[PDB]
Structures are given as structure tokens and as C-alpha cells.
Amino acid sequence: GAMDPDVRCINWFESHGENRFLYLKSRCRNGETVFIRFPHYFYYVVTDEIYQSLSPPPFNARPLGKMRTIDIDETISYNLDIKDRKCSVADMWLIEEPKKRSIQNATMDEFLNISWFYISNGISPDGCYSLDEQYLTKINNGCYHCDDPRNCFAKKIPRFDIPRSYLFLAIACHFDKKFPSVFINPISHTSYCYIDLSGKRLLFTLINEEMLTEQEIQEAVDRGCLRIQSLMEMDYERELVLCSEIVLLRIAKQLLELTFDYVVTFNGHNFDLRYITNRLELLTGEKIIFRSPDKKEAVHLCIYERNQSSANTTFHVNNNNGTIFFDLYSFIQKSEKLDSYKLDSISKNAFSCMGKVLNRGVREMTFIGDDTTDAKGKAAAFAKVLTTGNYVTVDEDIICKVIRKDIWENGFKVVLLCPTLPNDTYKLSFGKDDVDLAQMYKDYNLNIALDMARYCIHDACLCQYLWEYYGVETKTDAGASTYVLPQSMVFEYRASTVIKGPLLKLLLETKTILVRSETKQKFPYEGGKVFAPKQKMFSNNVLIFDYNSLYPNVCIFGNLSPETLVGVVVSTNRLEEEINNQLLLQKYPPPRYITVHCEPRLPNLISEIAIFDRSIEGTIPRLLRTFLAERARYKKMLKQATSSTEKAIYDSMQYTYKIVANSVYGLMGFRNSALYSYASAKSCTSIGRRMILYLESVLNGAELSNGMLRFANPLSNPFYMDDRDINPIVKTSLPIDYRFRFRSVYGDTDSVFTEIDSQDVDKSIEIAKELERLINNRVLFNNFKIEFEAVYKNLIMQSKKKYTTMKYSASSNSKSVPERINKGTSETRRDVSKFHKNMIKTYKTRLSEMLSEGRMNSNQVCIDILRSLETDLRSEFDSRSSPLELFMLSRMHHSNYDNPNMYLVTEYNKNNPETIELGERYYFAYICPANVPWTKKLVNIKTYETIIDRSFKLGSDQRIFYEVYFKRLTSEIVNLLDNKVLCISFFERMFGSKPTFYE
């Protein structure tokens, strides 16, 4: 009877009729659900003069107070005759209007109506409230109307936990050669994972009858499956249900129309749901129909798109019912930089564990994972995925089917269909059920249909596992709070729109309005600066130092904001450059003003100088100052919360403030943005560049002798004369007997790598921690800090994107287990041969020993190691002692989307007693006739690919086609090398071709 007045807001959404409304979906402590409706207004901000003049009066208005309005138009000056920035003060009004309205000179137009709703009425989109029932009037069961939200929502109350309902889903469409088209191909499967308010999971998968034999259908029934003839007969406690395609589609329709909190897919918005919807419209007449919670608006499901070049398109469902249709694909692209956005890749990363072996032999390994085996509850997470997973991937390579599983709350025992190399321990990776679908569909039978069902339910459940892993629920709520937006808009809108809420709040708080009175000219800060290490291979340890949030702190330091910019002073020749510099310094001295040299904006200017006044904190610096403070708060709250549900909330809030802070740099460069400021953006880049160069100049050739650190240049502030002791010789608390020497080896936009002449990681960590302290106390200034992240032993690196090293972190000691770090690569287990592996391992082991001698040019190493290669290469080409085993390579057999490999295995099967069946793992080598000499052309090496079965013996009139293996090997070797012109000569001489260089 009585409504629970204690509610937690969980989404907000709009109808769009001619008679339109805002709706809240909330949840009570019991679990009841309350929809509340609010009238829609369009908000306008006007000056008090405009307000007084208004044609008919506005529906309503509230004063905002006096506010300054500042012209932020950027202008260049060829001298120091720079006019003051236009700035007026007036009383402002927020006005409300039920119909749209053109008001000739209204201000603050860039900000969103919804943002004004929350701000004006004092409502947090993720808040809990004791609603004042006095201000609600019922209109359906469960749906109330609220004319006065400010009063109705007046009692905010602390957050209480709530339960939520989820539908995760996946489909499977038939195909042979082309991508599935709705006009011809039927849906074969629809799988669903339902999570109830209780926490109960319900799995069910609907199989399409019409792609099976009547005999087969009856087999399925006899085996366990429910068969059904209409929607009416569906029983959701049956995990497997056979039915017609139309029934299947009507079931989808019934489920998709329900008001789940979240309907979650992987690429469902562009494919799965689009497919269901069109295939339904085809076979029956029917539409999927969404209604507002008061039944006033009804829309047909219709996928729309949103676009954003820097770049990608995203797809969105138009439901008007409060359900969040959430596509993990789009979200994962937005929120993570990854090599692949395929679901098998994303799952591999997310779900792995360490497997201690319990049995061996037959064709069945066995593993256990638990707290003992890897890390606390990392097995627990793997175990959850195993409930529905049917293929584990051992040690990065060996794909293999599960045979049995035992699962408890903390661990899993799992027996797999693989080969054998039984060490005590191995790495287990999850992901899909890998297959050849196209073949399965070609040979379709009952056992395949059941396999596909197992496959398809797992893809649905992968969405819930990823949703857990990526913490989307709490990120949505955190986003809603921070961005002052509906939960459903958080990951739909782009970064230039989500920043506007907290910006609007700050402008209100600082009683400030920023107005651009002119077309912005075009250009953004483009440049494409990418970063090349001084050398690739490292004999010695490398110390890693990160600036802390460099661009946020740069903006704070410089007070860089479009309205704190006094002007830009440009020059076309050195006479103007010099007069202007000396006038600059008289008229705009430090520390009140900072002056920043920027890449000049026109090809004929030789200098460009931005001058910022630091006396009154600018808008952008203050926004950033807020976001860092908020982040700090939540990081503390995170460490004082102890309930894991709380940990999740504060960890999300913290993360959300990182992200939005880091959005600001790019937004200063983006012309369609409320934070655009060409000068500020450029000045931010430029101040950051200098902080990297300064740190590097000081550390490059620095030495430590006695207790003293001799920095390589004086510790002078690069922007202006400073209070600080610039003396570069500095007392350290280290051992007097230590004597070491430092080299600035690599640095990028916010990071600096320092080589120390030492391999003793224990000492290297001692020293870096001290280097950290002295850098922060003596080298740096104001809000610039570094932290020392890690030591990198055996660094081999090519860029920040492609590198390999043993990482010993700050927490680490000499003798704990490293973290093998690999980045950007593509090899191992039969991309490359044992000959290559053995050669590269020797040429590294010999090259690192050649750098510990210290006796080198770039060339005395380069010549010495290209000599050694020639000899070893000509020797193997002559002696020929290395077994064929050392040149074998592997591959999986499968059907096409690949094309010449079907021809290869076909012709082997067609010509040999044995068959390589369509899921088998076969070996191969590059073999040619023995009367071919050293060949400097190449062909399609493909013609010399030769399957090597157990019988195979190398022809007396055949040779291992050594050239292919050498050319790949010397390619890897010249990219370890630093001298480039030597390397390109060797590679034309030996192989008649030009090498690759991973740039």
C-alpha cells in the first residue's frame, strides 16, 4: 500500500513528444521501484536588462546574482600594445520556459538543460532521498508526478545498498561465405543470462528447430531439451529450449520490452539487437515497443548513431522506459587502449590464473588454481568464468577443450585436452569457446547445435563477467555524480559534453561567464610528436620516473586559461623579437606573469609568446584543482572503507576524477569545446616539454660520489629567476662508498628513463628512491613532483609501444619475482623457429656482454656483431649440421574467413595416407630443391611451405630453404642495433632487399 519514501536514483530519461517530460527511475530499500515524472523546461541565462524587457514574461525565473562576463577571444600582437580584455558585470537570471525560445542575446547557451535541472533543484543524479509525498501525485501504479522537485527532493540521505536486475544476452546467426544478412540468414541461437534482484543467475538458450531434422529434434527432447510450439509454452527454468524462429523472435521481443535495469551486450547495438529487430519485422509484422513509465509515449526500437572525429561511431538504443541498453564493445573502446577489441582478446587479458599441475600424460593435463597458486581471489575470478567456459588457453598458445571441472568459492580444479610439458606451474587464460563457425553451420546437426548453444551462452555470460571486471555499474554512478548527468548518458556522450556539468557548477560558484564573440580560427596544437630511445639494448638497469599528472599541474602552475591570457606577442624578425622580449620583461614581470614560448601559428613568425596573469586563479586551473582534490578525497575514503561494495564505489569515483582531469588537455585544443584555448593548449604543451628537458639535462651525466649527487647542470628554474638554491652538488643520505653515473636515455610527454651504470637492483632501488627525494626537494618546484615507478632490468625497447624488460617495482626488493613485461609483439611457439629463438638468445647474451665492457662506438659493437652473423650464417649454409627440427613451424587448420593454406593442407590430405582434420595442429618448414643456390630474389615463400608429418624425411635432393629463416633472423638483429646505415648495407648485400624497422 504505502510507498517507501526512501529511494535511490538509478537512471534518468526523457520522452520527446510534443507534450514531453523528464523521468526518474528509482529503487527503494525493499526493492520496489518508483518512477517519478517531472515537467520539462528549456533553460536560458539572461542579463537583468534583457529579463526586464521580455516579450511575454518567462514561465518562471530565479536570480543568479552578479556575474562577470569576459571576452575570451584570443588575439595576436606584433608589439606590446595589448588592449585590456572586455569585461562587464550584471545581474543574471536563470529563466524557465515550456516551449523553446529564441532570446536575442542570452548567455551560457553551451550548457545542457538536464544539467540545469539537477543544479537548479539541488538534485544529485545518483543520490538517495526521503521523498516528501506531499509533493507527489500518483498517476499509474508505481508512477508519480512531481511539480515541485526542489521541495520533493529536499531531504538528501546517505547511500543505501540496492539490488538490481540485469539481462545479458548474445545471439548466433547462420552464414556460409559472406557476413550474415538479415534477408537470407536465420538466427540459430539466442542465449540469455538473467540476474535477479536476489543475485540468482538464470541461464537459458533458445535453439532454432527449423535448422534441424525432425529425428534430431526428437533426439534433443529424448536427451533433455524442452521443445515448444508458442511463446505461451516457454519455461524459463529450462536451460535448453528448441523452438521455431518466429517463437524465438517473439520471446526476444517479450524480454526486450521488460524494464530491466540494464540490458547488456557485446556489440549488440550494432549487430545482435539490430538483427533480432529486422528479422522480426521480416518474418512477422512486429516491432519491439518501448513505453514511458506513465504509458504516455510509445516508440519502436530503433538504433541511432553518434559520431566523433579526433574517429569512431557508436550505436545506441532509443528506449524511453528507463532501462539502460549498454554495449560493452563501445564502452571498452572509449575507456581502454588495447591492441585488439575482439572479445577473445579482451577476455584473455581479463581472465587468467596460475595452474599448479596435479596429473600428466594420456592427452589430458590437469591443473588446480587457488589462493596458494597465484594471488588472493584471482583463481576465484577464473573459477566463476569456468562455470560456462568450455576452452582454456594454457601458456599463451595451447588452446584446449575442458573435460571436467571442480569449482568452489576460491579455487578450481580443471582437466584439459592438451599435449604435455609438465612443469610445476603454468598460465591459464580464458575467453570464448574458439571454433570454426562457418564449418559447423555447413555440417549442422544436433551435436553441433548443442555445441553452439554452449558457445553462445558463454558469450552472454562473458558480458556479465566483463561487466563485473570493468566495474561498469559503479563507474556509471560515479560518472553520473561527477558529470552531473543521467546514468544512461555517461558513456553515451563524448568528453566535450561530460565536462560541461562540473564546468557549469564552477562558473556559477566563481560568478563568471566566458563569451567568445568571434569565429574561432582553425588549427588545434597538431604535431604527432613520437619518442625514440637513445639506444635499444640495455646492459644496465634503467630507472623509471613519472611526473605526477603533468598537464593538469602545468595548467595550475602557469594559470593557463583563456581569460587569464593577457595576450600573445609574435615577431617576424630578430629585431622585433628582441625589442618585444625586453619590453615583455619590463611590462609583465615574474612571478605575477609567466611568458611561454610556443610553436608559432604562422609560417613567417619566428617567435610566439603567450603571457598569462597568475594573480587571479583562472577557470581551467581551478576546475583541475577541484578534480585533483576530489580524487585525493576518494583515494582516502577508499583506504578507510572496508566493505568491498564501498571499496568499489570510492575506487570508481577516484577513477572518474582521473579521467575527467586528463580530458582537459585535449579539450583545450578541441575547437568545438567549452574549454578551447589555442594559447593555453599550446602553452601547456610547451611548459610540459620544458619540464621534461630540464629534468633530463640535470640527470644526464649526473654522478654520485661520496655522499654527494652531482647534477649535470644547475638547478635553475627554466621560466624565471627563482628563490631556490641552484647548486647542483647535493647531499644525499646514501653510502659514501657508492660511485655511480647516470644517463638520460629516453623521455616522452610525462616520463623519463634514466640508465644507471649498475645491475644491482637492490642498490638501484635504494638510489632511485633517493633520486626521487632530491628531485622533488631541490630540482623541481611549486606543484611539480615525480614518483619513481620501477627499475627495468634487461630493457630492450623500440618505443613506449614496443618494449621488453623485467620490471622490479618500487615496492619490490632484489629477490622477489619480477614482472616479465612484453608489449606490442607478435611471435612464440611456431611463428618463429627454434633456430631463430636459439640465435636471438645468443646474440642478445653476446650483445649485453659487449655493452658491459664499455668499449664501443655505435659501430665497434655493430661491425663486430654483423661479422659474427655472416660467419655463423655462412657456416650453417655450408656445414648444415642443424636438425630439420630447428626449422619447423606450426599452425592450426581451419576453413576460410587464409586462402593458400587450404590449398596446402588439401593437397597433403589428397596425397598422403594420413589426414589433417579441420581442427588439427600441423608442422611445416621452408624446403627447396638442393640445386637452388643462395637466392637474393624472393618469391611467394608460400610455394616452399612443406608440411612435415611423422613419416617425412628430408630429400637427398632437397635443402632447408635457409634464406627465409636468415632474412627474418637478421631483421630482428638489426632492430636491436642502433647504427642504421651499416645495417641497411648488410641486408641488401646478403638478401637483395631493404629491411623493416619497428618505428
Side-chain angles (χ1 to χ4, degrees), residues 557-558 566 581-596 609-615 717-723 781-782:
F557 172 78
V566 174
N581 285 5
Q582 94 197 345
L583 293 172
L584 259 156
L585 196 145
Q586 279 160 225
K587 196 178 181 190
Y588 296 126
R592 169 166 171 185
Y593 302 94
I594 177 159
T595 59
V596 187
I609 297 174
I611 297 149
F612 298 83
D613 183 348
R614 304 151 123 200
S615 76
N717 184 306
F719 314 96
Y720 52 74
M721 174 64 172
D722 206 38
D723 73 84
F781 48 84
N782 307 57

Coordinates of all heavy atoms in Angstrom, one line a residue, residues 557-558 566 581-596 609-615 717-723 781-782:
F557 N 50.2 25.5 -12.5 CA 51.5 26.3 -12.4 C 51.4 27.6 -13.2 O 51.8 28.7 -12.7 CB 52.6 25.5 -12.9 CG 53.9 26.2 -13.0 CD1 54.7 26.5 -11.8 CD2 54.4 26.6 -14.2 CE1 55.9 27.2 -11.9 CE2 55.6 27.3 -14.3 CZ 56.4 27.6 -13.2
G558 N 51.1 27.5 -14.5 CA 51.1 28.6 -15.4 C 49.8 29.4 -15.3 O 49.8 30.5 -15.9
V566 N 46.7 37.3 -21.1 CA 46.9 38.8 -21.3 C 46.9 39.0 -22.8 O 46.3 40.0 -23.3 CB 48.1 39.3 -20.6 CG1 48.3 40.8 -20.9 CG2 48.0 39.2 -19.1
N581 N 60.9 41.2 -26.4 CA 61.3 40.4 -25.2 C 61.7 41.3 -24.1 O 61.4 41.0 -22.9 CB 62.4 39.4 -25.5 CG 61.9 38.2 -26.3 OD1 60.8 38.1 -26.7 ND2 62.8 37.3 -26.5
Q582 N 62.4 42.4 -24.4 CA 62.9 43.3 -23.3 C 61.7 44.2 -22.8 O 61.6 44.5 -21.6 CB 64.1 44.1 -23.8 CG 63.9 45.5 -24.4 CD 65.1 46.0 -25.1 OE1 66.2 45.5 -25.0 NE2 64.9 47.1 -25.9
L583 N 60.7 44.5 -23.7 CA 59.5 45.2 -23.2 C 58.6 44.3 -22.4 O 58.2 44.7 -21.3 CB 58.7 45.8 -24.4 CG 59.4 46.9 -25.2 CD1 58.7 47.3 -26.4 CD2 59.6 48.1 -24.2
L584 N 58.4 43.1 -22.9 CA 57.7 42.0 -22.1 C 58.2 41.9 -20.7 O 57.4 41.9 -19.7 CB 58.0 40.6 -22.7 CG 56.9 40.1 -23.5 CD1 57.4 39.1 -24.6 CD2 56.0 39.4 -22.6
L585 N 59.5 41.8 -20.5 CA 60.1 41.6 -19.2 C 59.8 42.9 -18.3 O 59.8 42.7 -17.1 CB 61.5 41.3 -19.4 CG 62.2 40.7 -18.2 CD1 63.2 39.7 -18.8 CD2 62.9 41.8 -17.3
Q586 N 59.8 44.1 -18.9 CA 59.5 45.3 -18.1 C 58.0 45.4 -17.7 O 57.7 45.5 -16.6 CB 60.0 46.5 -18.8 CG 61.5 46.8 -18.7 CD 61.9 47.8 -19.8 OE1 63.0 47.6 -20.4 NE2 61.1 48.9 -20.0
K587 N 57.2 45.3 -18.7 CA 55.8 45.4 -18.5 C 55.1 44.2 -17.8 O 54.0 44.4 -17.1 CB 55.1 45.7 -19.9 CG 53.6 46.2 -19.7 CD 53.0 46.5 -21.1 CE 51.6 47.0 -20.8 NZ 50.8 47.1 -22.1
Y588 N 55.6 43.0 -17.9 CA 54.9 41.8 -17.4 C 55.9 40.8 -16.7 O 56.1 39.7 -17.2 CB 54.3 41.0 -18.6 CG 53.2 41.8 -19.3 CD1 53.2 42.0 -20.7 CD2 52.1 42.2 -18.6 CE1 52.2 42.6 -21.3 CE2 51.0 42.9 -19.3 CZ 51.1 43.1 -20.6 OH 50.1 43.7 -21.3
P589 N 56.4 41.3 -15.6 CA 57.5 40.5 -14.9 C 57.0 39.3 -14.1 O 55.9 39.3 -13.6 CB 58.1 41.5 -14.0 CG 56.9 42.4 -13.7 CD 56.2 42.6 -14.9
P590 N 57.9 38.4 -13.9 CA 57.6 37.3 -12.9 C 57.6 37.9 -11.5 O 58.2 38.9 -11.4 CB 58.8 36.3 -13.1 CG 59.9 37.1 -13.7 CD 59.3 38.3 -14.4
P591 N 57.0 37.2 -10.5 CA 56.3 36.0 -10.7 C 54.8 36.1 -11.0 O 54.1 35.1 -11.2 CB 56.5 35.3 -9.3 CG 56.7 36.4 -8.4 CD 57.5 37.4 -9.2
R592 N 54.3 37.3 -11.1 CA 52.9 37.5 -11.3 C 52.5 37.0 -12.7 O 51.4 36.4 -12.9 CB 52.5 39.0 -11.2 CG 51.1 39.2 -11.7 CD 50.5 40.5 -11.3 NE 49.3 40.6 -12.1 CZ 48.5 41.7 -12.1 NH1 48.8 42.7 -11.4 NH2 47.4 41.7 -12.8
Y593 N 53.3 37.3 -13.7 CA 53.1 36.9 -15.1 C 54.1 35.8 -15.5 O 55.2 35.9 -15.1 CB 53.2 38.0 -16.0 CG 52.3 39.1 -15.7 CD1 52.7 40.2 -15.0 CD2 51.0 39.1 -16.2 CE1 51.8 41.3 -14.7 CE2 50.1 40.2 -15.9 CZ 50.6 41.2 -15.1 OH 49.7 42.3 -14.8
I594 N 53.6 34.8 -16.2 CA 54.5 33.9 -16.8 C 54.4 34.1 -18.3 O 53.4 34.5 -18.8 CB 54.2 32.4 -16.4 CG1 55.1 31.4 -17.1 CG2 52.8 32.1 -16.7 CD1 55.2 30.1 -16.4
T595 N 55.5 34.0 -19.1 CA 55.5 34.2 -20.5 C 56.0 32.9 -21.1 O 57.1 32.4 -20.7 CB 56.4 35.3 -20.9 OG1 57.8 35.1 -20.5 CG2 56.0 36.6 -20.3
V596 N 55.4 32.4 -22.2 CA 55.6 31.0 -22.6 C 55.8 31.0 -24.1 O 55.0 31.5 -24.9 CB 54.4 30.1 -22.3 CG1 54.6 28.6 -22.6 CG2 53.9 30.2 -20.9
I609 N 54.7 34.4 -28.2 CA 54.8 34.4 -26.7 C 53.5 34.7 -26.1 O 52.9 35.8 -26.2 CB 55.9 35.4 -26.2 CG1 57.3 35.0 -26.7 CG2 55.9 35.4 -24.7 CD1 58.4 36.0 -26.4
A610 N 53.0 33.7 -25.3 CA 51.8 33.8 -24.5 C 52.1 34.3 -23.1 O 53.1 33.9 -22.5 CB 51.1 32.5 -24.4
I611 N 51.3 35.3 -22.7 CA 51.6 35.9 -21.4 C 50.3 35.6 -20.6 O 49.2 36.0 -21.0 CB 51.7 37.4 -21.6 CG1 52.8 37.8 -22.4 CG2 51.8 38.2 -20.2 CD1 52.6 39.1 -23.2
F612 N 50.5 34.9 -19.4 CA 49.4 34.7 -18.6 C 49.6 35.4 -17.2 O 50.7 35.4 -16.7 CB 49.2 33.2 -18.3 CG 48.9 32.4 -19.5 CD1 49.9 32.0 -20.3 CD2 47.5 32.2 -19.8 CE1 49.6 31.3 -21.5 CE2 47.3 31.4 -21.0 CZ 48.3 31.0 -21.8
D613 N 48.5 36.0 -16.8 CA 48.5 36.6 -15.5 C 48.1 35.6 -14.4 O 47.0 35.0 -14.5 CB 47.4 37.7 -15.4 CG 47.4 38.5 -14.1 OD1 48.0 38.0 -13.1 OD2 46.8 39.5 -14.1
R614 N 49.0 35.3 -13.5 CA 48.7 34.4 -12.4 C 48.2 35.0 -11.1 O 48.2 34.3 -10.1 CB 50.0 33.7 -12.0 CG 50.7 33.0 -13.1 CD 52.2 33.0 -12.7 NE 52.8 31.6 -12.7 CZ 53.9 31.3 -12.0 NH1 54.6 32.3 -11.4 NH2 54.3 30.1 -12.0
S615 N 47.7 36.2 -11.1 CA 47.3 36.8 -9.9 C 45.9 36.4 -9.4 O 45.6 36.2 -8.2 CB 47.3 38.4 -10.0 OG 46.3 38.9 -10.7
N717 N 65.4 27.2 -12.3 CA 64.0 27.3 -12.9 C 64.0 27.8 -14.3 O 64.6 28.8 -14.6 CB 63.2 28.3 -12.0 CG 61.8 28.4 -12.4 OD1 61.4 28.7 -13.5 ND2 60.9 28.3 -11.4
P718 N 63.5 27.0 -15.2 CA 63.6 27.4 -16.7 C 62.7 28.5 -17.1 O 63.0 29.1 -18.2 CB 63.1 26.1 -17.4 CG 63.2 25.0 -16.4 CD 62.8 25.7 -15.1
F719 N 61.7 29.0 -16.4 CA 60.8 30.0 -16.8 C 61.2 31.4 -16.3 O 60.8 32.4 -16.9 CB 59.4 29.6 -16.4 CG 59.1 28.2 -16.7 CD1 59.2 27.2 -15.8 CD2 58.7 27.9 -18.0 CE1 58.9 25.9 -16.1 CE2 58.5 26.6 -18.4 CZ 58.6 25.6 -17.4
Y720 N 61.8 31.5 -15.1 CA 62.1 32.8 -14.5 C 63.0 32.5 -13.3 O 63.1 31.4 -12.7 CB 60.8 33.5 -14.1 CG 59.9 32.7 -13.2 CD1 60.1 32.4 -11.9 CD2 58.7 32.2 -13.8 CE1 59.3 31.7 -11.1 CE2 57.8 31.5 -13.0 CZ 58.1 31.2 -11.7 OH 57.3 30.4 -10.9
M721 N 63.8 33.6 -12.9 CA 64.7 33.6 -11.8 C 63.9 33.4 -10.5 O 62.8 33.9 -10.4 CB 65.4 35.0 -11.8 CG 66.2 35.3 -10.6 SD 67.7 34.2 -10.4 CE 68.5 35.1 -9.1
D722 N 64.4 32.5 -9.6 CA 63.7 31.8 -8.6 C 64.3 32.1 -7.2 O 65.5 32.6 -7.2 CB 63.8 30.3 -8.9 CG 62.7 29.5 -8.4 OD1 61.6 29.9 -8.4 OD2 63.0 28.3 -8.0
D723 N 63.7 31.7 -6.1 CA 64.3 31.8 -4.8 C 65.4 30.7 -4.5 O 66.3 30.9 -3.7 CB 63.3 31.8 -3.6 CG 62.6 30.4 -3.4 OD1 63.1 29.6 -2.6 OD2 61.4 30.2 -3.9
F781 N 59.9 22.3 -8.4 CA 59.4 23.5 -7.7 C 57.9 23.6 -7.8 O 57.3 23.0 -8.7 CB 60.1 24.7 -8.3 CG 60.1 24.8 -9.8 CD1 59.0 25.3 -10.5 CD2 61.2 24.4 -10.5 CE1 59.0 25.3 -11.9 CE2 61.3 24.4 -11.8 CZ 60.2 24.9 -12.6
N782 N 57.3 24.4 -6.9 CA 55.8 24.6 -6.9 C 55.2 23.2 -6.9 O 55.6 22.3 -6.3 CB 55.4 25.5 -8.0 CG 56.2 26.8 -8.0 OD1 57.4 26.9 -8.1 ND2 55.4 27.9 -8.0

